[PDB]
From Swiss-Prot:
<feature type="domain" description="CSD">
    <location>
        <begin position="11"/>
        <end position="75"/>
    </location>
</feature>
<comment type="similarity">
    <text>Belongs to the YBX1 family.</text>
</comment>
<feature type="modified residue" description="Phosphoserine; by PKB/AKT1">
    <location>
        <position position="52"/>
    </location>
</feature>
<comment type="subunit">
    <text>Homodimer in the presence of ATP. Component of the coding region determinant (CRD)-mediated complex, composed of DHX9, HNRNPU, IGF2BP1, SYNCRIP and YBX1. Identified in a IGF2BP1-dependent mRNP granule complex containing untranslated mRNAs. Component of the U11/U12 snRNPs that are part of the U12-type spliceosome. Identified in a histone pre-mRNA complex, at least composed of ERI1, LSM11, SLBP, SNRPB, SYNCRIP and YBX1. Interacts with IGF2BP1 and RBBP6. Component of cytoplasmic messenger ribonucleoprotein particles (mRNPs).</text>
</comment>
<feature type="site" description="Important for C5-methylcytosine-recognition">
    <location>
        <position position="15"/>
    </location>
</feature>
<feature type="cross-link" description="Glycyl lysine isopeptide (Lys-Gly) (interchain with G-Cter in ubiquitin)">
    <location>
        <position position="87"/>
    </location>
</feature>
<comment type="function">
    <text>DNA- and RNA-binding protein involved in various processes, such as translational repression, RNA stabilization, mRNA splicing, DNA repair and transcription regulation. Predominantly acts as a RNA-binding protein: binds preferentially to the 5'-[CU]CUGCG-3' RNA motif and specifically recognizes mRNA transcripts modified by C5-methylcytosine (m5C). Promotes mRNA stabilization: acts by binding to m5C-containing mRNAs and recruiting the mRNA stability maintainer ELAVL1, thereby preventing mRNA decay. Component of the CRD-mediated complex that promotes MYC mRNA stability.</text>
</comment>
<protein>
    <recommendedName>
        <fullName>Y-box-binding protein 1</fullName>
    </recommendedName>
</protein>
<feature type="region of interest" description="C5-methylcytosine binding">
    <location>
        <begin position="15"/>
        <end position="20"/>
    </location>
</feature>
């Protein structure tokens, strides 16, 4: 079932481009850049369905092997709570 390089780690989203549908999350545990995709967002805000991630927000995610090296997966907010998302999305 794929390879997991790292488990639920906390990282700060440097930025996430909604148009690109992807962004980069800086791992705050290893200080390594991690690639995140909108399909890596397991939970979305229930008030509004957004495929965006809040920039500057600290989120928790698992690290799995990606074609770019490391890919974030199961991206959720702290405690497994839904991500707020970007201020403006969709």
């Amino acid at each position: 079932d794929k390879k997991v390089i790292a488990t639920k780690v906390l990282g700060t989203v440097k930025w996430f481009n909604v148009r690109n549908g992807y962004g980069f999350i800086n791992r705050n545990d290893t200080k390594e850049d991690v690639f995140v995709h909108q399909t890596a967002i397991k939970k979305n805000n229930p008030r509004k369905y957004l495929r965006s991630v809040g920039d500057g927000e600290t989120v928790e995610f698992d690290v799995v092997e990606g074609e770019k090296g490391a890919e974030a997966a199961n991206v959720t907010g702290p405690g497994g709570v839904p991500v707020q998302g970007s201020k403006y999305a969709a």
